[PDB]
Amino acid sequence: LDSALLRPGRIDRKIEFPPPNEEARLDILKIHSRKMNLTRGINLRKIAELMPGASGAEVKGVCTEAGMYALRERRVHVTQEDFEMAVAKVMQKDSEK
Amino acid sequence: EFLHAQEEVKRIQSIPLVIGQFLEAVDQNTAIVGSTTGSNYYVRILSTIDRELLKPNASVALHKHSNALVDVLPPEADSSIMMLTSDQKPDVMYADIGGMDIQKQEVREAVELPLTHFELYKQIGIDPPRGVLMYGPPG
Amino acid sequence: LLREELQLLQEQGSYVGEVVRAMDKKKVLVKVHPEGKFVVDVDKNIDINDVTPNCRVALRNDSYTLHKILPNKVDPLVSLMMVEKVPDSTYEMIGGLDKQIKEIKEVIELPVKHPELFEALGIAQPKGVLLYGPPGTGKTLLARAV
Amino acid sequence: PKNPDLRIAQLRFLLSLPEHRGDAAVRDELMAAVRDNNMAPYYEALCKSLDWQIDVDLLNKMKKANEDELKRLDEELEDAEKNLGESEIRDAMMAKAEYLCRIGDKEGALTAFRKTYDKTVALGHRLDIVFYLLRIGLFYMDNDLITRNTEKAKSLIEEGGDWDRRNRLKVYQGLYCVAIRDFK
Amino acid sequence: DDIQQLLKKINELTGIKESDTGLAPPALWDLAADKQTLQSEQPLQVAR
Amino acid sequence: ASKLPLVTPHTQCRLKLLKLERIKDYLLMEEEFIRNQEQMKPLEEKQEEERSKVDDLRGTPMSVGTLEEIIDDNHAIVSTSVGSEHYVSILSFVDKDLLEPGCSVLLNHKVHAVIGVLMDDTDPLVTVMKVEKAPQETYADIGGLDNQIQEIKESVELPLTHPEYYEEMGIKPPKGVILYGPPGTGKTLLAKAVANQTSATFLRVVGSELIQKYLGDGPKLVRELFRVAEEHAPSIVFIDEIDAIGTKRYDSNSGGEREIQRTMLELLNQLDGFDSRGDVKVIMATNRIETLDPALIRPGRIDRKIEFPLPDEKTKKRIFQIHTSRMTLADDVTLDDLIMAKDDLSGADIKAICTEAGLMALRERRMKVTNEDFKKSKENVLYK
Ligand SMILES: Nc1ncnc2c1ncn2[C@@H]1O[C@H](COP(=O)(O)OP(=O)(O)OP(=O)(O)O)[C@@H](O)[C@H]1O
Ligand SMILES: Nc1ncnc2c1ncn2[C@@H]1O[C@H](COP(=O)(O)OP(=O)(O)OP(=O)(O)O)[C@@H](O)[C@H]1O
Ligand SMILES: Nc1ncnc2c1ncn2[C@@H]1O[C@H](COP(=O)(O)OP(=O)(O)O)[C@@H](O)[C@H]1O
Ligand SMILES: [Mg+2]
Hints:
This is part of a larger assembly, with 2 copies of chain A, 1 copy of chain B, 1 copy of chain D, 1 copy of chain E and 1 copy of chain F.
Chain A: E1 13-16, H1 22-32, H2 44-50, H3 57-63, H4 66-72, H5 80-94
Helix pairs in contact in A: 1-2, 3-5, 4-5
Chain D: H1 5-16, H2 24-33, H3 43-48, H4 56-73, H5 77-80, H6 88-103, H7 106-116, H8 123-139, H9 145-157, H10 167-179
Helix pairs in contact in D: 1-2, 6-7, 7-8, 8-9
Chain E: H1 2-14
Bound molecules: adenosine-5'-triphosphate (ATP) (2 copies), adenosine-5'-diphosphate (ADP) and magnesium ion (MG).
Organism (chain E): Homo sapiens
Family (chain E): Belongs to the AAA ATPase family.
Protein name (chain E): 26S proteasome regulatory subunit 7
């Protein structure tokens, strides 16, 4: 960006936003997991460990998509294997270009 | 006597009924409409109209001179009426499209599966899609 | 009341208008939909301070006499954010950005609730915030949230 | 905290209603009662219990420890308001008012809960506060007060799906429907 | 000051006041007072 | 109302006595020539009767029209709001003057005859580009420069406040003022103190926002800009960062650099047109003084060329004293160590380090600012 925008008296504060670690991939799964109809026994920690830090948008990109698996096998409770069935697909799109 | 006057008020209806559209009302039994002529008006009602048959987009009826509410209308659209269903399908089968296993199943997921199995999307609560955009190279 | 409606229903329609601003001697300046601006009068039951600029009105058509104030229409910004439709957010959907919350509160939250607190130090209040990092990291929901 | 708080009332049932079986219940119920700062809910349970003549210093050390948490709230309310966060007075006692809910009676619970209900602009705290009012509504068998915050609770789950706040809630309505004789 | 004020105390009795929205001074217009009010308006057309 | 402009005297003079008593002559004699009107011919009130006779000529449906031409024998072609224009006549209460081609007027409803004229609600652009109030403190806020302050007061302030020195000399002020140097040196900050000092109408425009996306809207914006600048009175037009019209190319502009060029031709006219210019002073500022057209930098279009050097270290300590004036400075700090931290630090660097150090104090809720706040403050501000 502009050096005139990089005048030190111009900008008051610049804040960096890192991609999430294993700790901060878990809680976005936690808040994002609220509106889903789950199945008891999930171990979200493993699911957060399966994603090696894409961003906070692939969290919703997986966990919204996991309901399509339970719906395409006509469940009414989303199970844990839907999520590992989803991470290897969305992370295949991470593996796509 | 009130049944005699009860039928008397509808003489303003006749044939030349203003074709406007309901927008809102200030109060009880006095409203604001917009005509099909292009302008808007502050109009009166006729009392026998069930007011709970109002406010979607259904076209109301206006007098051509005095210009007040006359009668509620069943909906109308000229565009493409409703795809008349007899000689209207372009008789393309699903088998006629070869090699679209992802997208043919995927648009089925988005369009007609919430159409039919609505309560699965309701019960799991996964927010079924409102509209869909599709694109790409031509042909 | 039922019998009067055969006779009263013999009147014309009332126009809708739009007050730009009022002027001297009990008169206002009112435009129509696609019809030009008119310098018209007011009726006796309407106050000038009650006449607000940028407000619709009911108008009679024969003498263009002012009839009644039309409720309201829109702000020119409510329609704007209505078109834009940002995803409204909150602190309860923040995923692990807690120090950044504390950083943005110091710049934005403090010179609203406590502007005197900077005059306790004799420095000016900040104005500009740069948020940077990869996309998909919570920038839009954070700025909407604050 | 209110998470082990149902076992307390179940062991009050275990104290009172079996008449011959009232010894180990008043042993372990005291084992939980004269620790973890409990003051109010066992004076009449002490009346249904034996004398327990020297409970005075036992009450004094715990009204003193209760006074410690009260006065550090009284050390928090003025530092919280000097440079304000999200109303950090009600953000401190929005968590320690459940401590005051267990330790104090329902009043210092209720004025602080209906107090802090207007603080958070999202239901992520509100609906948990309402869950707490439901749980004390079971405790004092507040059969009219549960009818309010059940509907006021359920009025929040429609935005979002919130199935850890709806299926969890169904356990509360199920325990109410088996508390009353509504088996189907 | 009383004669500079009495300037205003009779110049309000003349009529130059009522700060307009586009009117003439009230002494300026008396050509169209009785004759051209009904002469430059009532016989006269628009002639678009 | 503009009755007698002789208000000289400034003591107990008899001229003042006899002249005010001769205003008492024109007012006592002719207040006795005010009594007789309604005494002899009442016949109306004339305060509202003839007024309501005009108001009974003109109807309540007052259509708003637009002028485009004038024929003198009180009829002209006026534009309707639809577009279908008429050839109506003009009344006698129309005060035949405030009538220009393009003016908003008041017409009849029936025959659309020219009833009245309308005061114009102007355009928002004037309020947009017009500075309303004084921005900040005076020239004492600046510090250390002290040489070109006499230059800007010389070319701008002194011609305004003292119109005697140029007339005893038989001379006119220099026209154009330009300001150039490194960035952050206080170029806009001087114009802040100028906008404090002057009583003239002040306009400010950035050189980036000159450029447009449509064709000719740039030079048209120039023409209406200097129109607005002239149509007031004594005025000061400020231009910030005029190199940006030549440096950065944007894809919003449909024309290429040969549309920017034509905008520079229009502005190049508007500095030194053959027209009578008026009392409009021009103050400009940039940092890339070498990039733009020297045809605009010639004497006649810009007369005074003002460079801003970097602050020397004895002026730096003054600027530290300025930006650390009203703050609770703990005695831990030594400003001389803060002076030689950067060898070419700007005045903005000092203020940034001060404000961020105050931010470091407010992270820890203290009242005074200590030395380590500056130690990590120069790391935060400078080194990244
Ligand atoms: N299975 C198939 N996949 C792709 N194309 C096919 C297939 N079968 C036939 N086609 C040919 O491709 C064309 C698709 O027609 P269609 O009008 O849908 O193209 P399009 O993608 O809409 O492009 P355009 O928008 O330019 O019409 C047909 O003319 C047909 O001849
Ligand atoms: N000599 C100085 N003394 C005190 N403060 C200064 C000085 N120079 C600059 N500053 C401060 O730095 C800030 C930026 O200065 P200014 O805007 O004049 O820079 P500039 O050269 O005009 O930049 P540009 O012209 O490229 O926008 C001002 O707010 C001002 O307070
Ligand atoms: N900390 C977080 N908690 C929950 N969701 C998050 C978080 N960070 C990002 N998201 C997701 O990312 C989206 C917002 O992306 P954001 O980074 O704000 O927009 P942009 O990509 O334009 O910066 C939200 O829809 C949300 O689901
Ligand atoms: Mg500057």
